[PDB]
Design a protein around this ligand. Structure first.
Ligand code: BCL
Ligand code: BCL
Ligand code: BCL
Ligand code: BCL
Ligand code: G2O
Ligand code: G2O
Ligand SMILES: CCCCCCCCCCCC(=O)OC[C@H]1O[C@H](OC(C)(C)CCC/C(C)=C/C=C/C(C)=C/C=C/C(C)=C/C=C/C=C(C)/C=C\C=C(C)\C=C\c2c(C)ccc(C)c2C)[C@H](O)[C@@H](O)[C@@H]1O
Ligand SMILES: CCCCCCCCCCCCCCCCCC(=O)OC[C@H](CO[C@@H]1O[C@H](CO)[C@H](O)[C@H](O)[C@H]1O)OC(=O)CCCCCCCCCCCCCCCCC
Ligand SMILES: CCCCCCCCCCCCCCCC(=O)OC[C@H](COP(=O)(O)OC[C@@H](O)CO)OC(=O)CCCCCCCCCCCCCCC
Ligand SMILES: CCCCCCCCCCCCCCCC(=O)OC[C@H](COP(=O)(O)OC[C@@H](O)CO)OC(=O)CCCCCCCCCCCCCCC
Ligand code: SF4
Ligand code: SF4
Ligand code: SF4
Ligand SMILES: [Ca+2]
Ligand SMILES: [Ca+2]
Lengths: 102, 667, 143, 113, 50, 220, 113
């Protein structure tokens, strides 16, 4: 289908939670090692030839490093199913009750 | 086919899962379902209270030998003697009345609990139809009771939890007044403001009834605002109330410990030392290998004593076995451990809700102070760092004091007990809260502070770093499951960062500061690890520090002394074995070995499949499942915590053995 | 975050302002993360660069304002080498670079390796990406 | 299938017969009034009942999680409570039938000993 | 004055200026006996003035 | 001895065969290439402790039991049951019913009460006891699945020490707290566990025999 | 720098003036033949020595793990051996200066007692 999902082998820490949600009948997600795993040398990949666009890896909302992206069918690249609204923040301290500022 | 296997270990994976131990998770429960569950559980509680009352029968007034003593009823017998429902009476005549009263109260609890369970079941099914009238009640808008439900709460049943606090407080005022009138009518005990008798309980029940009624009126007409607990009261309000109940329960344990030793409580607890107790599983009258029955008199194989025919349970005095403070310690430590556990669970469930609102952006959308404080990422770091620094200071100081005390006892490096911290007592302005204030009580206060701060470290890590931490902010990572055990060996390893694992670490850390209570309430001289041991100078504490009591033994020698009685009895011995068994099995799931277990279980599956063909026949498709590190940590925390506190119970329930005779120096 | 409350060797690239940042947007990204999602050629030779955020809600362009927000250390731009508007043969360039240090136990990990490459802005040249010891520009060159 | 129980029971009885055979090979003096045939049979009963109880606890409590759900709001806690009450009554009608009294029948319930 | 009396009586009450985490420090120091909290309150109430 | 030898032989055989791959990891897309790596993360529900180093640690911890059996047999400590010589019901009746010519020290669990009266009576043995117990339980800090918790907390320690040293002390506090990686954590934990238990198995051995030849007539 | 060694000592001397100051408030009766000036100081010195020894052991065993290399072929076992020697000789010159005899000086070595 459309909206391919991909894995960035630059944020991925190889936790495999994406692999846990990939259907066993399609081994879309896998492992590459290239070294010791104590130094992040166990990144994961998505075999785009086997991926059938389940959304399971991405919609599960478990990628901790934002390596799963789910590029949209046209061009849009997501990073997580929902993102907080990017709010301006400040600390509210009252004048002479509760707080006293200063 | 290597894929049919794959959707077998893709079944316990710690993704978002059903997790059978979350069927009653508050996310899928509404307010009325919570009401119904609590009502049904209170009915079951009444059932088990009736069962305990039945276990309290000693004469069965219709005529039969009664029940042997057990901790389930011995922990409440002082209360029933206080209420006049049971007696410390030496004669059968006054004990038949106590048995009849306990039987009647057990039947009353059975009936009331059945009614309560039926009501909770109907609330659980959203079926508030009155079968007698055929109408149906409205959970959202109901008259409370009738005319009383209109003069106060003029219709308009509470629509929100902050609006429900007030009607709840009026309900608790009704509970207080009902208990007061139950005292006054059924249990005698007119309300006299004499704060040395049970009559003061009725008087203060009426006083608290008035106080709670006024407070409920005020909070009905002026509901307070915690604001955020109104929305996800399933987890926010629930967890806040859980930690509040935990602190209340620790306070109740302290109140019990102080009160049960007072002279006003003497006819209920101290008088337990004038009784003889026949506990289930205690040393029974043994007989030789060739007993041939034929009662009345033993012919072959005379038993231990000619009395107590056959296999009767031998008597044990309440003075040598300090049943007074044994029951006091059982109650106090039960409520203290329950309070600590409830505080930990409240912090954990609050962290669960808080991660849930951090994931959907509601975290920044909280207005109440209780989150606008910790939404800083630096005040979080400052708070956790100062808690860690205070814990380090207190724990290092107290542990070095304990180690120096032990060194001076054993005279390691040629030291002496006069070099110890025997002079380090609480201040005279602090000596009022201890009897025989010494280095033991100072060490107890500092160990309580150190353990509380040590667990507070993980509690603060739950409260603040539910979704992200400054380490994981610096890394490109975020926590989004509250139950994931790890992200892997990346960065050298990411084990146990979720708030569930932080809860487990808080429990394990509070194990020390909580068992330190068991040592203390048993009088076990935590000021050093080897006390009362005849090695070099450990028996000189009573003289060098001018002690008035004589505590059992040091931290390590506590497992030698007072274990003379755990071993002396079969029931406590088998509890010891079971507790140790359950406890060390937690290593099979805490040790970083889950993948080894998975690999070995695959090997065993292939073996059983092959062993089912070489010798047996037919397919052997069954495969061995391995608990994942989320399940492994849950089961391990349960196994570890239960294994240690099935034997802390043994320390508590094997006797007091804290005589008031300070032994002289070895000289 | 304050320098005295952070890990010692932390640069301003990894020091985040907006002290309560992690809960304002995605916690993974200290600064807002944008992706080069399309670079098409229409009419003239100039290419239209499309900056869609990691949130995937907008469809923006480099623009002087976002260029300033970039060079002020507030946003980050990546390309996702699997981008179909690429000029260099990234599939061969990724594969022959993993063949230096990756052993194909799975025989397909190198084949399906995709990574992000950051984009920086100098001024004289526009949004330019430095790849394989050579500085490519999105304007022509890299696409 | 019935072939598995025919082997679990078959294996248990085979190993019990093996215990009975090895009991006759070790020269031992039994208890004063006991039969050399029954005294290893009781030991094997205890051993097999121990392993079988462990199995059924693993077999049963593991299958409980596969069936526990919201429909177990009732009769799950009531089952645990009725287990309490059957155990408490068994500690009166099976274990320690009566209350400890001397051969004369006097209750030593206080410090009168 | 009023603030010194507050610090002596309820050291957290006088010290509400400083921080969200400093107030816990003053409160828990007050919990430990009563002198540590008062000492912290006076130290951080004389620090913005002296 | 047979059970413990075979039980540690399980880990030894896994070392000798599944050093690079196993039939489970053949069916997965995984291979072992480090002999010291701890895991591959929370994938497949977890891959903890699959390297030959971790299997060696498991073999050691498993042989701890089969070797404590040797300690308790050469001390005559009646490993045949968990209670012996304890006056509960019948643990003092073994020597009569079993027709023994020796009075073994105690049972398995009672072995820690008896033959410890002499450990306690001497300062040196008590100090060894305490140090062994301390070293042993410290191993939980690194064997438990807690390395990431320790790392997060250690970063907190670094930020605290540098915060407390910057605006209360002066100058940079560049030092950062190190945390043993999971491989280092498992190595240190195995040594801590093994030393903690066998610094006190020594106390079993070097505190007396106490296995007299007087078979304890039954209490009747 | 030097402010740390002015605070590690500064913190320790604070403990010296704090443990010694609270001994005069926590009213205690000292040892039969002892002075209240020095009896809290001895305990403080033992406590501080415990902490300082633990800290220096940690620092030393962390430093001789980054500094240890293949060049420590010698003087790694030789340092261990000389530590063993000094311990064994302190077992004779400082701790238990002589092999135990009676007050008269006689040796008892067999089961003649
Ligand atoms: C100790 C008393 C328990 C309780 C025990 C019962 C029992 C028992 C019954 C009800 C029943 C009902 N209760 Mg009620 N019920 C409790 C608290 C509540 C609360 C609440 C806190 O908001 C609500 C909305 C209700 C509402 C209802 C109605 C659905 C229904 C009949 C009301 C009536 O006759 O008058 N109960 C109190 C706490 N309630 C009756 C019912 O459902 O009839 C079909 C029923 O049998
Ligand atoms: C839900 C949001 C409302 C609220 C309204 C109620 C109501 C109504 C009740 C409680 C109840 C409890 N609340 Mg509340 N609770 C709120 C804010 C708080 C705060 C706080 C801000 O610090 C605290 C410490 C507590 C703590 C508590 C416990 C003292 C108490 C018993 C809990 C239990 O048994 O279940 N609530 C806000 C104001 N809370 C129960 C109680 O004991 O009332 C006397 C109760 O009936
Ligand atoms: C002082 C009493 C404790 C308390 C002690 C318990 C105990 C104990 C139990 C529950 C149980 C439950 N409690 Mg309660 N519970 C309290 C206050 C709350 C609050 C709240 C303040 O908002 C909520 C939402 C709940 C909600 C719940 C549900 C999880 C469950 C009842 C339905 C069921 O399945 O059966 N409790 C207070 C804090 N509650 C039962 C359960 O299953 O929990 C998982 C259970 O065993
Ligand atoms: C100064 C030398 C000792 C010291 C000597 C005392 C003395 C003396 C006393 C306390 C007492 C207290 N100390 Mg102290 N205590 C020390 C270090 C600490 C530290 C720390 C972070 O270092 C903390 C938090 C505490 C905390 C406390 C509480 C545990 C306890 C009761 C306070 C109260 O209000 O109630 N101590 C240092 C190491 N501590 C008081 C107490 O009641 O103890 C039972 C008491 O009299
Ligand atoms: C009570 C103690 C233990 C066992 C009993 C045991 C049993 C076991 N373990 Mg273990 N284990 C630890 C304790 C115990 N591990 C600890 C403390 C650690 C942390 C260091 C630990 C660690 C690992 C790792 C890392 C691996 C294993 C395995 C592995 C399996 C091997 C399969 C086999 O050959 O059969 C051997 C199995 C038996 C002999 C079981 C027979 C029952 C008997 C009568 C004992 C009764 C059990 C219990 C006492 C009673 C409770 C019953 C209930 C009803 C009350 C096998 C089930 C491995 C596998 O799963 O696969 C190979 C694996 O990889 N472990
Ligand atoms: C003796 C036993 C223990 C400690 C001592 C301790 C200290 C400690 N632990 Mg621990 N721990 C366990 C035992 C001990 N955990 C166990 C058995 C488990 C498995 C359940 C475990 C697990 C975790 C997890 C998961 C985490 C931590 C941490 C954490 C830090 C918190 C910072 C703090 O409160 O400072 C307080 C630290 C002290 C007061 C240290 C001073 C003490 C003494 C006077 C010093 C003696 C030290 C030693 C006994 C002798 C060495 C001397 C030498 C000569 C031989 C803090 C250093 C956490 C961090 O790393 O930072 C937050 C974390 O995440 N743990
Ligand atoms: C000891 C455990 C280990 C600690 C060490 C952490 C290191 C772990 C990190 C592992 C890596 C490692 O170590 O190896 C590698 C490297 O290691 C070293 O690098 C460093 C680590 C930077 C040096 C060590 C730091 C310091 C010198 C050590 C010594 C610092 C010591 C511990 C000072 C802390 C003392 C504590 C904090 C006590 C502070 C307590 C404060 C007081 C008591 C407050 C309470 C009293 C007041 C409130 C009034 C009391 C009152 C009164 C009177 C009346 C009534 C009432 C009611 C009341 C309450 C080499 O240099 C390199 O070469 C080597 O590569
Ligand atoms: C966090 C900050 C907490 C600071 C509060 C200071 C802690 C004070 C603790 C010492 C108090 C004390 O010893 O009480 C002193 C009192 C009585 O004090 C002496 O105690 C002796 C015990 O052997 C005897 O009872 C003597 O009669 C009595 O003189 O002790 C108790 O009975 C207290 C009840 C048990 C305390 C439970 C604490 C629960 C904490 C849980 C923490 C786990 C984590
Ligand atoms: C032919 C090849 C061999 C085939 C047969 C071999 C397998 C046979 C094994 C059977 C028995 C297994 C040995 C034990 C297995 C063992 O010891 O390891 C612990 C085990 C975890 O094992 P794994 O799942 O890693 O692997 C075991 C595998 O054999 C199959 O799972 O289970 C637990 O965690 C127990 C907790 C269950 C949850 C209980 C939580 C606590 C509940 C309350 C109890 C405490 C009360 C509170 C007190 C604090
Ligand atoms: C409560 C007291 C808790 C103190 C923790 C002891 C920590 C030992 C680890 C210390 C450690 O590992 O790092 C040692 C660190 C020196 O590290 P560097 O060599 O990176 O620092 C260069 C220094 O010369 C300039 O600071 O010394 C500090 O700055 C300690 C800061 C806390 C001590 C100063 C503040 C005292 C706080 C007092 C609170 C009142
Ligand atoms: S979930 Fe994300 S971080 Fe984890 S293995 Fe998959 S792509 Fe990598
Ligand atoms: S979309 Fe489906 S097939 Fe593709 S990687 Fe995700 S789970 Fe696997
Ligand atoms: S050792 Fe286990 S819990 Fe720890 S990171 Fe590895 S797989 Fe996760
Ligand atoms: Ca006790
Ligand atoms: Ca021995």
């Amino acid at each position: 289908a459309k909206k391919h999902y991909f894995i960035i082998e630059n944020l991925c820490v190889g936790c495999g939670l994406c692999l846990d949600k990939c259907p066993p009948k399609v081994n879309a997600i896998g492992y590459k090692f290239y070294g010791d795993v104590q130094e992040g040398g166990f990144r994961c990949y998505i075999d785009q030839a086997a991926c059938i666009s389940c959304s399971a890896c991405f919609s599960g909302d478990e990628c901790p490093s934002g390596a799963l992206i789910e590029v949209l069918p046209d061009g849009e690249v997501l990073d997580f199913s929902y993102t907080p609204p990017e709010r301006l923040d400040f600390d509210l301290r009252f004048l002479h009750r509760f707080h006293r500022e200063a | 086919d290597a894929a049919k296997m794959r959707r077998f270990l893709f079944q316990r994976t710690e993704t978002r899962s059903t997790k059978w131990y979350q069927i009653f998770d508050t996310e899928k429960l509404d307010d009325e379902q919570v009401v119904g569950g609590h009502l049904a559980l209170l009915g079951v509680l009444g059932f088990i209270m009736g069962i305990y009352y039945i276990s309290g029968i000693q004469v069965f007034p219709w005529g039969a030998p009664g029940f042997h003593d057990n901790w389930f009823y011995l922990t409440i017998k002082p209360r029933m003697v206080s209420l006049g429902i049971d007696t410390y009476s030496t004669k059968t005549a006054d004990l038949e009345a106590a048995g009849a009263r306990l039987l009647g109260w057990a039947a009353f609890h059975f009936l009331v609990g059945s009614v309560l369970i039926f009501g909770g079941w109907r609330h659980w099914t959203h079926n508030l139809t009155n079968p007698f009238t055929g109408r149906c009640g409205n959970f959202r808008d109901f008259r409370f009771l009738g005319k009383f439900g209109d003069v106060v709460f003029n219709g308009t049943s509470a629509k929100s939890y902050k609006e429900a606090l007030g009607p709840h407080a009026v309900y608790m005022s009704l509970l207080f007044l009902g208990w007061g009138i139950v005292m006054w009518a059924i249990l005698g005990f007119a309300p006299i403001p004499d704060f040395q008798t049970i009559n003061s309980e009725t008087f203060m029940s009426f006083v608290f009834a008035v106080i709670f009624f006024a407070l409920g009126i005020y909070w009905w007409n002026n509901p307070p605002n915690a604001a955020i607990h109104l929305n996800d009261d399933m987890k926010a309000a629930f967890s806040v109330h859980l930690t509040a109940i935990g602190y209340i329960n620790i306070a109740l344990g302290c109140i019990a410990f102080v009160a049960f030793q007072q002279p006003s409580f003497a006819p209920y607890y101290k008088e337990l030392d004038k009784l003889v107790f026949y506990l289930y599983g205690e040393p029974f009258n043994r007989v030789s290998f060739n007993f041939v029955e034929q009662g009345g008199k033993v012919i072959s194989g005379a038993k231990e004593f000619a009395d107590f025919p056959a296999y009767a349970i031998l008597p044990k005095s309440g003075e040598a076995f300090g049943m007074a403070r044994v029951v006091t310690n059982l109650i106090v430590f039960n409520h203290i451990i329950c309070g600590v556990l409830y505080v930990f669970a409240g912090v954990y469930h609050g962290g669960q809700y808080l991660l849930k609102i951090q994931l959907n952006g509601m975290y920044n959308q909280i207005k109440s102070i209780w989150i606008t404080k910790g939404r800083d990422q630096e005040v979080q770091v400052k708070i956790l760092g100062t808690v860690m620094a205070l814990c380090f200071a207190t724990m290092l100081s107290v542990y070095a004091v304990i180690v120096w005390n032990t060194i001076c006892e054993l005279n390691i490096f040629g030291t002496n007990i006069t070099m110890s911290f025997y002079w380090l007592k609480p201040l005279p302005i602090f000596q009022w809260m201890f009897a025989d204030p010494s280095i033991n009580d100072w060490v107890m206060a500092h160990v309580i502070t150190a353990g509380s701060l040590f667990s507070l470290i993980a509690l603060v890590r739950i409260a603040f770093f539910a979704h992200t931490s400054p380490l994981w902010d610096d890394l490109g990572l975020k926590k989004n499951s509250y139950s994931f055990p790890c992200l892997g060996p990346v960065y050298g390893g990411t084990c146990g960062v979720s708030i569930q694992d932080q809860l487990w670490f808080a429990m394990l850390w509070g194990i020390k500061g909580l068992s330190a209570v068991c040592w203390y309430i048993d009088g076990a001289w935590i000021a050093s690890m080897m006390y009362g041991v005849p090695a070099a100078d450990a028996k000189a504490w009573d003289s060098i520090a001018h002690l008035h009591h004589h505590y059992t033994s040091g931290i390590f020698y506590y497992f030698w002394t007072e274990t003379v009685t755990i071993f002396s009895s079969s029931h406590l011995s088998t509890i010891l074995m079971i507790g140790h068994l359950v406890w060390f099995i937690s290593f099979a799931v805490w040790f970083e070995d889950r993948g080894s277990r998975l690999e070995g279980a695959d090997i065993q599956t292939r073996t059983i499949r092959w062993l089912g063909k070489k010798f047996l026949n037919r397919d052997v498709n069954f495969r061995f499942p391995v608990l994942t590190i989320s399940d492994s940590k849950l089961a391990g925390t349960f196994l570890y915590f239960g294994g240690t506190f099935m034997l802390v119970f043994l320390f508590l329930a094997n006797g007091f053995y804290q005589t008031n005779s300070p032994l002289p120096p070895p000289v | 975050m304050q320098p005295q409350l952070s890990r010692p060797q932390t640069a301003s690239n990894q020091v985040r302002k907006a002290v309560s940042g992690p809960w304002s947007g995605n916690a993974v990204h200290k600064a807002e993360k944008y992706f080069i999602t399309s670079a098409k050629r229409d009419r003239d030779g100039k290419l239209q660069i499309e900056l869609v955020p990691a949130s995937g809600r907008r469809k923006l362009s480099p623009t002087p304002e976002m260029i300033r927000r970039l060079i002020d250390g507030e946003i980050e731009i990546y390309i996702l080498t699997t981008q179909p508007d690429i000029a260099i043969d990234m599939n061969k360039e990724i594969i022959d670079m993993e063949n230096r240090y990756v052993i194909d136990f799975d025989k397909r990990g190198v084949k399906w390796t995709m990574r992000e490459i950051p984009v920086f802005y100098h001024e004289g040249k526009g949004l330019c990406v430095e790849l394989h010891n050579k500085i490519y520009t999105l304007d022509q060159f890299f696409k | 299938n019935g072939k598995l129980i025919a082997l679990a029971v078959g294996g248990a009885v085979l190993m019990g017969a093996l215990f009975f055979s090895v009991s006759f090979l070790t020269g031992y003096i039994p208890a004063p009034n006991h039969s050399a045939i029954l005294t290893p049979l009781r030991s094997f009963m205890g051993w097999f009942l121990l392993i079988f109880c462990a199995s059924i606890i693993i077999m049963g409590l593991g299958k409980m999680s596969s069936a526990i759900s919201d429909k177990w709001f009732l009769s799950f806690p009531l089952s645990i409570f009725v287990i309490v009450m059957v155990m408490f009554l068994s500690l009166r009608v099976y274990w320690e039938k009566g209350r400890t009294t001397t051969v004369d029948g006097k209750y030593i319930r206080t410090t009168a000993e | 004055i009023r603030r010194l009396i507050l610090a002596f009586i309820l050291p957290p009450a006088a010290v509400m200026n400083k921080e969200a985490g400093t107030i816990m420090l003053t409160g828990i120091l007050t919990l430990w006996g009563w002198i540590p909290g008062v000492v912290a309150a006076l130290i951080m109430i004389s620090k913005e003035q002296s």
